[PDB]
Amino acid sequence: SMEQVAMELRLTELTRLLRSVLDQLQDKDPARIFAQPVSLKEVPDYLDHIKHPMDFATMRKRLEAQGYKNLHEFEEDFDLIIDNCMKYNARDTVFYRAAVRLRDQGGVVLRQARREVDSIG
């Protein structure tokens, strides 16, 4: 149907918006701390601590499969990246501090993304 193609243009346009949002969030991570999953070989206990690991490559695979149906789902994954890091790493560590800084800078991008997603539809 034509309706299913419109929905799909909508999902497609949301995806385009989420891709820009993603590339802008990932620019706020020059260290590339959040680019790939935490390695279970280098942190064998990780999954005892963190139940839903997240990282930007994993978010990107999902996005390219158009697996984000709204901004809320995308934000949920971005907050996992931050929140997992702040739980696993202590408050004085470079990792923890990078997540706080990513969060603060990410908020600015996301506050406008929410406006575009309502505004465009």
Ligand code: NA
């Ligand atoms: Na902690």
